[PDB]
C-alpha cells in the first residue's frame, strides 16, 4: 500500500501492584494510524501477555526519512506464511526512503511468492552501509563503477488514435 | 411411501416473537392459591380483627 513508518509506544494498564509498567516501542509500516495501532497490538500479543483492553497506547508518531534524497540499499528480514508452512527470507532493495523499500517488498512478495500483506511479518529493516554488506546479486549490479546503460526500444504513447507516419523506437 | 419431515423447530422463534414474548403482569397482591391452609385459616381471622380495630378508631373520630 501507500505506507508510512510509525512509532507506536504502549504499555499495560497501570495496576496497584504495578503502577509504572514497562513502555514498549515498535516501528510499524502501516498506511495510517488506525492500522498502526492495530498492528502494534497484533505483535505485542505475539510476545507479551497483554491485550488492547488490558493495555494502553501512549504515542503514535511518524518516523520521517532522515535523507529522503539519498540512494540507499536496504536489507529486510522477513517471516511469511506460504500455502504449506512458515518461512524466513532475507531480501535486499534499492530506494531512497525506508518506507519505499518496504513498499517494494510487499509488491515483490505478492509477485514472486503470492504472499499477502496479512501473511508477512517484517522482522527488521537495515541500511547496508558498506558495499560488502550487500549479498544479493540483483542489487549489486547497480553498485558497479561508472554504470551506464541505454534504454533500447522506446515506445511512445500516442494521443491520437491514428498516426500518419511510420513508428520508430529510437531513444 | 410418505417419508416426510418428522420435526423441526425452524421458524418457531419468529412466530414466538411476532406478538410475544410477553412477560406476565405483576400485581400488588398475588393469589393465595397453594398456600398452606393452616396459615390461610389464621390469616382470615387476623384480617377480620384488623379491619374491626381500624373501624372503631375511625368511628370515634366522627362521633
Amino acid at each position: 500500500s501507500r505506507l508510512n513508518e510509525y512509532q507506536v509506544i504502549g504499555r499495560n494498564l497501570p495496576t496497584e501492584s504495578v503502577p509504572e509498567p514497562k513502555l514498549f516501542r515498535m516501528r510499524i509500516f502501516a498506511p495510517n494510524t488506525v492500522v498502526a495501532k492495530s498492528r502494534y497490538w497484533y505483535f505485542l500479543q505475539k510476545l507479551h501477555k497483554v491485550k488492547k483492553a488490558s493495555g494502553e497506547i501512549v504515542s503514535v508518531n511518524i518516523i520521517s526519512e532522515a535523507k529522503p534524497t539519498k540512494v540507499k540499499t536496504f536489507g529486510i528480514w522477513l517471516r511469511y506464511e506460504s500455502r504449506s508452512g512458515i518461512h524466513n527470507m532475507y531480501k535486499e532493495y534499492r530506494d531512497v526512503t525506508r518506507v519505499g523499500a518496504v513498499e517494494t517488498m510487499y509488491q515483490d512478495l505478492a509477485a514472486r511468492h503470492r504472499a499477502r500483506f496479512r501473511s508477512i511479518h517484517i522482522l527488521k529493516v537495515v541500511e547496508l552501509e558498506k558495499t560488502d554488506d550487500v549479498k544479493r546479486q540483483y542489487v549489486k549490479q547497480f553498485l558497479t563503477k561508472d554504470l551506464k546503460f541505454p534504454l533500447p526500444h522506446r515506445v511512445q504513447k500516442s494521443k491520437k488514435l491514428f498516426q500518419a507516419t511510420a513508428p520508430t523506437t529510437f531513444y | 411411501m410418505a417419508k416426510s419431515k418428522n420435526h423441526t423447530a425452524h421458524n418457531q422463534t419468529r412466530k414466538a416473537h411476532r406478538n410475544g414474548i410477553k412477560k406476565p403482569k405483576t400485581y400488588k397482591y398475588p393469589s393465595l392459591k397453594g398456600v398452606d391452609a393452616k396459615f390461610k385459616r389464621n390469616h382470615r381471622y387476623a384480617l377480620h380483627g384488623t379491619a374491626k380495630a381500624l373501624a372503631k378508631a375511625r368511628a370515634e373520630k366522627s362521633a
Partner: protein, 159 residues
Amino acid sequence: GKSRGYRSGTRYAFQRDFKKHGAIPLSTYLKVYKVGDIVDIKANGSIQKGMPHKYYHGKTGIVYNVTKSSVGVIINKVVGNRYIEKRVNLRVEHVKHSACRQEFLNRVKSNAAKKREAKANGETVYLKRQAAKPRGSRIISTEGNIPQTLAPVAYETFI
C-alpha cells in the same frame, strides 16, 4: 425408541461435586426462608424427596409458601409465545438464598446514607450508578522506563 422420563438427561447435573458427597452440612437446614425471598434452585442428588425437575435446576425464583420442610418457589417459564406461572414445591436442601439482593439491599442503605449527609450539608448528591467511562488524559514519565523496541521474531521449529 425415545425415552423422556422425569430424570432423563440428568447424569451430570444431579451429581454431587467431586469430594463433596455424603451428608449435608447443617447450615442448609438452619437458613430461614420468608415469603418474598429470592432463592437459587440447585437440585441435590443425595435427597430424592422434594427434588426439582431438571428444567428448574439453575433457575431463580420467589418464595411464596413456607411448609414443614419445604418452600414454594415461583418460576417463570417460556412456553411458546408467553411466560407461564409455575409453582414448584422444593425441600430446603435444593434451595439457597440468592446473593443478588444482599448486594442491592446494601446500595439502598448506602444511597439513603449518602443522601442524608448531603441534605445535612445542604448540597446535592448524585446516586445513579455510572458505566466505565473512557479514561482521561495523563502524563507518562520515562525516567527509569525508557521504551524498549520490540520486533517480531523469526520462525523456528521447537520440536
